[PDB]
Design a protein around this ligand. Structure first.
Ligand SMILES: C=CC1=C(C)[C@@H](Cc2[nH]c(/C=C3N=C(/C=C4\NC(=O)[C@H](C)[C@H]4CC)C(C)=C\3CCC(=O)O)c(CCC(=O)O)c2C)NC1=O
Ligand SMILES: C=CC1=C(C)[C@@H](Cc2[nH]c(/C=C3N=C(/C=C4\NC(=O)[C@H](C)[C@H]4CC)C(C)=C\3CCC(=O)O)c(CCC(=O)O)c2C)NC1=O
Ligand SMILES: C=CC1=C(C)[C@@H](Cc2[nH]c(/C=C3N=C(/C=C4\NC(=O)[C@H](C)[C@H]4CC)C(C)=C\3CCC(=O)O)c(CCC(=O)O)c2C)NC1=O
Ligand SMILES: C=CC1=C(C)[C@@H](Cc2[nH]c(/C=C3N=C(/C=C4\NC(=O)[C@H](C)[C@H]4CC)C(C)=C\3CCC(=O)O)c(CCC(=O)O)c2C)NC1=O
Ligand SMILES: C=CC1=C(C)[C@@H](Cc2[nH]c(/C=C3N=C(/C=C4\NC(=O)[C@H](C)[C@H]4CC)C(C)=C\3CCC(=O)O)c(CCC(=O)O)c2C)NC1=O
Ligand SMILES: C=CC1=C(C)[C@@H](Cc2[nH]c(/C=C3N=C(/C=C4\NC(=O)[C@H](C)[C@H]4CC)C(C)=C\3CCC(=O)O)c(CCC(=O)O)c2C)NC1=O
Ligand SMILES: C=CC1=C(C)[C@@H](Cc2[nH]c(/C=C3N=C(/C=C4\NC(=O)[C@H](C)[C@H]4CC)C(C)=C\3CCC(=O)O)c(CCC(=O)O)c2C)NC1=O
Ligand SMILES: C=CC1=C(C)[C@@H](Cc2[nH]c(/C=C3N=C(/C=C4\NC(=O)[C@H](C)[C@H]4CC)C(C)=C\3CCC(=O)O)c(CCC(=O)O)c2C)NC1=O
Ligand SMILES: C=CC1=C(C)[C@@H](Cc2[nH]c(/C=C3N=C(/C=C4\NC(=O)[C@H](C)[C@H]4CC)C(C)=C\3CCC(=O)O)c(CCC(=O)O)c2C)NC1=O
Ligand SMILES: C=CC1=C(C)[C@@H](Cc2[nH]c(/C=C3N=C(/C=C4\NC(=O)[C@H](C)[C@H]4CC)C(C)=C\3CCC(=O)O)c(CCC(=O)O)c2C)NC1=O
Ligand SMILES: CCC1=C(C)/C(=C/C2=NC(=C\c3[nH]c(/C=C4\NC(=O)[C@H](C)[C@H]4CC)c(C)c3CCC(=O)O)/C(CCC(=O)O)=C2C)NC1=O
Ligand SMILES: CCC1=C(C)/C(=C/C2=NC(=C\c3[nH]c(/C=C4\NC(=O)[C@H](C)[C@H]4CC)c(C)c3CCC(=O)O)/C(CCC(=O)O)=C2C)NC1=O
Ligand SMILES: CCC1=C(C)/C(=C/C2=NC(=C\c3[nH]c(/C=C4\NC(=O)[C@H](C)[C@H]4CC)c(C)c3CCC(=O)O)/C(CCC(=O)O)=C2C)NC1=O
Ligand SMILES: CCC1=C(C)/C(=C/C2=NC(=C\c3[nH]c(/C=C4\NC(=O)[C@H](C)[C@H]4CC)c(C)c3CCC(=O)O)/C(CCC(=O)O)=C2C)NC1=O
Lengths: 162, 177, 116, 139, 172, 162, 177, 162, 177
């Protein structure tokens, strides 16, 4: 995963050099912004079941065909609505994994790479998940730079789908 | 945000905090003559370094036994402490000009100030003499009646805030009386 | 790994403008950030030499000493120092050159049907 | 050896000031800041920092510390219609530092000019500086 | 690449001398604005696919002759390569926002960009009018007062315009 | 010349990426070691004149033969000492240049790149040169973290010759 | 318009100011021999950097105990602080040359400097030797009788201004004696 | 452009080979089915305006939200419906180009390459075009081996959207 | 050749619109600031003999290997040409700022001088050290902070204009690069 630590290590064995002070400052700036990051990952984990079931309902209010179309790709079954709710469980879990390590490493490894090939093979529209993520982005209730860190990894998940 | 002015002070912690342009007029509507009052602080803190130096040297050049070997303005650690001591009472009276009350000046600075000076042997008759020069400077700077540095201001009168700081300096002198 | 995220859309356009060659295009693919986190972080230096001789040179490894003899190039001057000393060998130039995407040379015996 | 005085603290300080002034709340005062430039972005701010002083500031305080009035004069010969005088007092630093004692090796060192610092390498008047006097091929 | 600190190193290495004291207090003014630089690059790259597709959509509206058949941006190969180059300028402008000078934008992206376009035949006057949509969609994005506290950052938004007009005059 | 800003850019470009929050934190730590490195190379020019030949006399009083040997490659006569107000001033110049950029930039390409070819074919052995700046690392007159950041790139230049 | 000059020197901060062509005629008419005096301040500040580098090294060249370990030109910050004390007095004596008085010299630079130097451990008779070179170096630049440099000037004498800086440099040496 | 003729040329050019009897039956078998494929291309050309507008309405009957939802990616306006009819006319035109050349050359070059960059950017769903092409597959009204050639290149386009 | 007034026309041509009030607001403020730019370029062309004096006698003291017998400015035709080659390239940017557009600089000289120069044998790093020695020579003159000659302008701040002649001369140097 690409953290700010593991990219400072990565430029060192690029050249095969030792760890100088052109990489200690990269880890130093990570430790500054990790105190406004783990206060964000704590609050998203604590209100996770409020955010997930509120974001499934924001998709179903905007796209009411998905609750009533027959077929396997839609959440009109009992098992269609469970697969929808664990998908927004997966999109919130990779945001709090990315806030902990301080970079887009876990959602590059687990969400982003290979996403187009499974949304095309299983007929999942990528505008569903932007509406599930736009509900989270202005109703987590955070305030300040703790809000400014959650609105950079939710917005990174949107720009992959957008 | 006047409480968030106080929340710089009351959490005992070194930060930096400001007030923006839309957030100014909420304080400016609340605090009466805030265009006078923000000029009243800025007349002081633009010359806050020069206000302590004429105050301490007029205490020295009128009481010449203070810089004696054995006097309390010898031994340059002790001289630099006295110049530091005039700075903290200048910033606390400047913050009392901003907040409009001396109630943050009384507990943070003046509380326990009397017997902590005879704890170290400060001549408090010289200290009342030291703060009275700062009382003469702050009525010169706010009224723009300093004999050497005039500053540009909007035209008007500032005689209430001249008397308020001269009231607030007298609480310092009565705390060490 | 020919996924949408693993494509190199700026390296693809410089091939089509004839700015870089095929030999500079293979060098951009080993130094590509998908090739690091998927094929270089998950094995050691003695297995990664078995990848970069089977795919780049198109031949098998000679014996196990060649994996020992090559793996110090990656640990001293790096992966970017490892590919250009592997793309300047005579085995790369005498059957691929500056214009051929490499391939597995002589996988099968011509009368047969099984091979390697 | 450039700062062999990094901690030295001969203040007596018996602990009889602690019931009236705490250790964390010691020599700390609210300093008020002003971005007053008659502009829309004019901010007032306060911050609460440690207060230090030095013993020199009876006559040379921190606003007037090392601020001396410099003069720059542009004057060509007979060009008083474009000649000018300017005046400012910045925080004025001195010239670059004095060198080694030096016996007579190569050339002490120097520096001059406006854009950049230059610096050459004159032994004692003569300024050798990489002409390669040892030029002896062997034919 | 060079940033602003790498300027005066190489602007005094051929000069020979050391760093003079009258320059670096302007450079320690720049670190007061270091926190107003990094929000602002975060304002651009969070919306980095909503400035591209909202301005290519407003490009083909006013110029229908590019998506008509026989046009330059007609096929799906050449539509994807029109949205590719519309995002490439959005990277290298925001690279020049974080650094302090132009010299990675016009050395890796603008050094022969119009002479790339004269050889391919794309209308080089029309890429400038897509960039000037992206200039107005990003300068007006970087004046919001949500997410940051307020204060005058009027000095730092002229630098964001000044590289967007540098790509507007590179391509014609 | 490898500024810590410029490898946040160059390791956002070889992957073809916008500047994410990973590389935004590494330039924040460059803004955190900014002021504590800028008092170093400012005031090192303010005491530069003593440090050139006050360090040269800390070589000839270590090595008496360097004034006594018959050869072109020493400071024996008056022409070798004029190179010795130049060739160790280049070591004093680039240690100021590294504290401008906050990394090991300018001496990585101007000084250390291709150096053994200069050393072996002039017989300019670095046993003088390590002790040429070993007087600088302890007699600079600097304290605090300004000392440790000014001493950070000095002993990178020590270990490249040692 | 010397009030515009005095407001620059009284504000106690860094502020640039300059004179156009109309107010320079007000400068040349208010100050007598202004064609002579503005030459005399320009002959010093064109070579002010070599004057401070020669004189305190000439102070080293006669008093070599200052660069001893334990001397006051050791520990190169303190060596540069002697160079910083070299350059302030040359800018202050040039403005004292330009204004035609020493009333700006006494309060801003000469007040309490003797008490400052005996509290900081500064050898004040060594600085008398350093400032006596400055009295010789300013006279040879005003009279243009420097041995190594010769600047172009208009014809005539400057011996009133050559004697006026000797009145000004002796005021510095009387202040630190 | 891969045709049967520009593929057997390419395997002849790989081996330095003159066009043997191996490559003269790959090009002969194109001629025994160019009869049936060019009647299918002529029939789909004539019935274009029946098949384009009929498939554009069969999308709107299956997915009725596309005519209802606001925003520029939908068929809820006049110009939204005109661009949808343009798109099925682009799709049906490349089916007839493949029946001329005898293979999937012209829809590889002009349609398929770069298509997923558009459908993610402009928020267009790939299942809007399966329903448009499954209309055209069983409403062209052809029969026999003329239908076998048109039904080969229609579901090549379905498999590159799926 | 392009004009900035012509620049909004081809902006409005492939767009196929008329001229609106929206892009008109840039050009009407360009009119009233036209005299300030007209107060700039008259002093660029009237001190041009000094700017080509310090173009070539300044670059030759920082690499004197061209006046050496065998160099690239040795003979008195190449001595004459280097005086002549620099006085055309500042004549072209005086044309380029009145239009505002750099394309008149590009099509006339900056398309192809680099391909001649390695067949004419001159080095390009010597050229950009002679290009940039006119760069700061230019930007003193537009602001009136030049030392030895100070000229007549009005009072204001043309630092938007002073970046523009610095926005030309790097592309002068990057063309040879
Ligand atoms: C040697 C003996 C010695 C003294 C007797 C005092 C001199 C002195 N000055 C002031 C008085 C003052 N001092 C200042 C301060 C300043 N004025 C400025 O223009 C600067 C900005 C700033 C630092 C110099 C101001 C503004 C006044 C009030 C104006 C005035 O009456 O002088 C006062 C108080 C008024 C009074 O006389 O009652 C005294 C006692 N200082 C000494 O060292
Ligand atoms: C951001 C920081 C900030 C400040 C520093 C103040 C500064 C300030 N004060 C006034 C305006 C004023 N300021 C003063 C004050 C004074 N006039 C005098 O003659 C005395 C010397 C001095 C007393 C201390 C007076 C009397 C007015 C006019 C009445 C008023 O508006 O309060 C004005 C309005 C001027 C105008 O537009 O006409 C401003 C901007 N306000 C701010 O928002
Ligand atoms: C929170 C508010 C706050 C203050 C008001 C000051 C109060 C203060 N002053 C001093 C300490 C001192 N204060 C003075 C000052 C003076 N003596 C004189 O003769 C003059 C009259 C006057 C200066 C003009 C001196 C000289 C000392 C040091 C005494 C010594 O160390 O011997 C101490 C030291 C004891 C300790 O640290 O516990 C404290 C708390 N400091 C603060 O933190
Ligand atoms: C506006 C008034 C004003 C001045 C007149 C100068 C003078 C001046 N110099 C120093 C400070 C100093 N000044 C000297 C200078 C010298 N010591 C010598 O042995 C030489 C004789 C001489 C140089 C030629 C030195 C060595 C210090 C260092 C002491 C220190 O840093 O603590 C200080 C600080 C002392 C303190 O903190 O109290 C001041 C105010 N600067 C000013 O701001
Ligand atoms: C990793 C990413 C990263 C960032 C992007 C910045 C973000 C950031 N900005 C501010 C803080 C601020 N940010 C702004 C900025 C702005 N206000 C405006 O009107 C403009 C739209 C915008 C500039 C682009 C202002 C005005 C302040 C408060 C003033 C100040 O910084 O002191 C703060 C609080 C700390 C501080 O005050 O400096 C932080 C963390 N920092 C980071 O670590
Ligand atoms: C704007 C800036 C400005 C200046 C720098 C001065 C410069 C200056 N001084 C004089 C004119 C003069 N200048 C000098 C001065 C000197 N002659 C000497 O031999 C001494 C070395 C030196 C004194 C230090 C004298 C003696 C005259 C003639 C008498 C006089 O006009 O005062 C002239 C006129 C020359 C002439 O008549 O052609 C000028 C331009 N005046 C200014 O307006
Ligand atoms: C090692 C021991 C050592 C010294 C004792 C002094 C030597 C020295 N030089 C001057 C004297 C001077 N020094 C200068 C200064 C300069 N001349 C120039 O042309 C430059 C612009 C500038 C820096 C070199 C001037 C102008 C004079 C007066 C004229 C002269 O005698 O040269 C004086 C004062 C006159 C006197 O009383 O003798 C002394 C003592 N310098 C040393 O290095
Ligand atoms: C190497 C040998 C050598 C020279 C030939 C001169 C030439 C010279 N002049 C200037 C520097 C300059 N040269 C001029 C030009 C002029 N000033 C005027 O007012 C006149 C009208 C005009 C014709 C002489 C200007 C305006 C500056 C900038 C300094 C200033 O005046 O502000 C520079 C510095 C530019 C740079 O390199 O970055 C040099 C090298 N000086 C030298 O060291
Ligand atoms: C648009 C403007 C413009 C020009 C620049 C010239 C371009 C140009 N320059 C030179 C020719 C030259 N130009 C230079 C000048 C220089 N070479 C150096 O080494 C220095 C870097 C630099 C001086 C600053 C020299 C020295 C010659 C050589 C003349 C010769 O070879 O005889 C020639 C050859 C002339 C001939 O063969 O007759 C031409 C066409 N013409 C133009 O219309
Ligand atoms: C016949 C020849 C001819 C000219 C020379 C110009 C003359 C000229 N200059 C300006 C006017 C001006 N010129 C400047 C320019 C400058 N001021 C500075 O402080 C900088 C040094 C410099 C460039 C940045 C400024 C600031 C103004 C005033 C603003 C304006 O009205 O334009 C004006 C308008 C006001 C006036 O009438 O004076 C005119 C006509 N036009 C002509 O027709
Ligand atoms: C952690 C990274 C990760 C992602 C992103 C992921 C997506 C993913 N979503 C899937 C299915 C699904 N996703 C949905 C979701 C929705 N349908 C709706 O109607 C709603 C509008 C909407 C969201 C609420 C449905 C109904 C399926 C089942 C479709 C099928 O099986 O054909 C499947 C098929 C297998 C399955 O889970 O049954 C994958 C692989 N899997 C992963 O491991
Ligand atoms: C490293 C950064 C980088 C730059 C600067 C770059 C320019 C660049 N643009 C190109 C093509 C192109 N660029 C465009 C774009 C446009 N034409 C128009 O008419 C529109 C106005 C505009 C889109 C909005 C088009 C249509 C092509 C042709 C694609 C092709 O012919 O295959 C090509 C040919 C290769 C290709 O992409 O197909 C290059 C090299 N390429 C890069 O990789
Ligand atoms: C990239 C920065 C850089 C490096 C690394 C460098 C090394 C360098 N040192 C040199 C010479 C020299 N350097 C010295 C200095 C010394 N030799 C000693 O034995 C003394 C102990 C020490 C004095 C402190 C001397 C005496 C020479 C002359 C050797 C000769 O020319 O024979 C030379 C020959 C050219 C010259 O005369 O300068 C090079 C290239 N030059 C550079 O520009
Ligand atoms: C020949 C290869 C080729 C393809 C496939 C292609 C697709 C393509 N379809 C587009 C738009 C579009 N396509 C649709 C189509 C639809 N939306 C609906 O609601 C309907 C369900 C559906 C029609 C079946 C709409 C509404 C737009 C406009 C999107 C916008 O303006 O933002 C655009 C954006 C430009 C435009 O037409 O305005 C492209 C490039 N272009 C090509 O060159």
């Amino acid at each position: 995963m690409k953290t700010p630590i593991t990219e400072a290590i990565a430029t060192a064995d690029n050249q095969g050099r030792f760890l100088s002070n052109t990489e200690l400052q990269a880890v130093n700036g990570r430790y500054q912004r990790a105190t406004a990051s783990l206060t964000a990952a704590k609050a998203l984990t604590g209100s996770a079941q409020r955010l997930i079931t509120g974001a499934a309902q924001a998709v179903y209010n905007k796209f009411p065909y998905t609750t009533q179309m027959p077929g396997p790709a839609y959440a009109s079954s009992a098992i269609g609505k469970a697969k929808c709710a664990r998908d927004i469980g997966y999109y919130l879990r990779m945001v709090t994994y990315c806030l902990v390590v301080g970079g887009t490493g876990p959602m590059d490894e687990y969400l982003v790479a290979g996403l187009e090939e499974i949304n095309r093979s299983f007929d999942l529209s990528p505008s569903w998940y932007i509406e599930a993520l736009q509900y989270i982005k202005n109703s987590h209730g955070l305030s300040g730079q703790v809000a400014n860190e959650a609105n950079a990894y939710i917005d990174y998940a949107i720009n992959t789908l957008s | 945000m006047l409480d968030a002015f106080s929340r710089v002070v009351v959490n005992s912690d070194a930060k930096a905090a400001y007030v923006g342009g839309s957030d100014l007029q909420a304080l400016k509507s609340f605090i009466a003559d805030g265009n006078k009052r923000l000029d009243a602080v800025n007349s002081i803190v633009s010359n806050a370094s020069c206000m302590v130096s004429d105050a301490v040297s007029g205490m020295i050049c009128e009481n010449p036994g203070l810089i004696s070997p054995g006097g309390n303005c010898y031994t340059n650690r002790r001289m630099a402490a006295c110049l530091r001591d005039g700075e903290i009472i200048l910033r606390y009276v400047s913050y009392a000009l901003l907040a409009g009350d001396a109630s943050v000046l009384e507990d943070r600075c003046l509380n326990g100030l009397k017997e902590t000076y005879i704890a170290l042997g400060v001549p408090t008759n010289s200290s009342i003499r030291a703060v009275s020069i700062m009382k003469a400077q702050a009525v010169a700077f706010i009224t723009n009646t300093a004999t050497e540095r005039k500053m540009s201001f909007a035209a008007g009168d500032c005689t209430s805030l001249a008397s308020e700081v001269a009231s607030y300096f007298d609480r310092v002198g009565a705390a060490i009386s | 790994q020919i996924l949408k995220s693993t494509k190199q859309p700026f390296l693809e356009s410089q091939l089509r403008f004839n700015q870089i060659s095929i030999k500079d295009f293979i060098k951009g693919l080993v130094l590509s950030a998908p090739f690091r986190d998927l094929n270089y972080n998950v094995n050691n230096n003695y297995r990664f030499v078995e990848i970069c001789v089977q795919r780049v040179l198109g031949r098998d490894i000679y014996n196990e000493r060649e994996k020992i003899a090559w793996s110090i190039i990656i640990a001293t001057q790096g992966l970017e120092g490892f590919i250009d000393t592997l793309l300047n060998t005579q085995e790369y130039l005498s059957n691929f050159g500056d214009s051929i995407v490499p391939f597995q040379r002589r996988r099968i015996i011509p009368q047969r049907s099984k091979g390697e | 050896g450039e700062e062999e005085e990094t901690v030295d603290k001969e203040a007596p300080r018996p602990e009889l000031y602690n019931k009236y002034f705490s250790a964390d709340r010691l020599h700390k005062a609210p300093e008020i800041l002003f971005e007053y430039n008659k502009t829309k972005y004019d901010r007032v701010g306060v911050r609460y920092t440690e207060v230090t002083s030095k013993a020199s500031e009876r006559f040379f305080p921190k606003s007037r510390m090392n601020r001396a009035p410099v003069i720059e004069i542009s004057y060509r010969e007979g060009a008083v219609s474009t000649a000018s005088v300017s005046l400012s007092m910045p925080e004025i630093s001195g010239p670059p530092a004095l060198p080694f004692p030096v016996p007579k090796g190569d050339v002490t060192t120097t520096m001059v000019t406006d854009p950049t610092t230059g610096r050459l390498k004159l032994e004692f008047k003569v300024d050798g500086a990489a002409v390669s006097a040892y030029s002896d091929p062997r034919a | 690449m060079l940033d602003a600190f790498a300027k005066v190193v190489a602007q005094a290495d051929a000069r020979g001398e050391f760093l003079s004291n009258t320059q670096i207090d302007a450079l320690s003014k720049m670190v007061k604005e270091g926190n107003q630089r990094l929000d602002i690059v975060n304002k651009v790259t969070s919306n980095a696919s909503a400035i591209v597709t909202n301005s290519a959509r407003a490009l083909f509206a006013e110029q229908p002759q590019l998506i008509q058949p026989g046009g330059n941006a007609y096929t799906s190969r050449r539509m994807a390569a029109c949205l590719r180059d519309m995002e490439i300028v959005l990277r290298y402008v925001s690279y020049a926002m974080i650094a302090g000078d132009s010299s990675v934008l016009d050395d890796r992206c603008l050094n022969g960009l119009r002479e790339t376009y004269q050889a391919l035949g794309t209308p080089g006057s029309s890429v400038a009018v897509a960039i000037q949509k992206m200039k107005d969609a990003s300068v007006a994005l970087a004046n919001d007062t949500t997410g940051t506290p307020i204060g005058d950052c009027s000095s730092l938004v002229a630098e964001l315009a000044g590289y967007f007009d540098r790509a507007a005059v590179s391509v014609v």
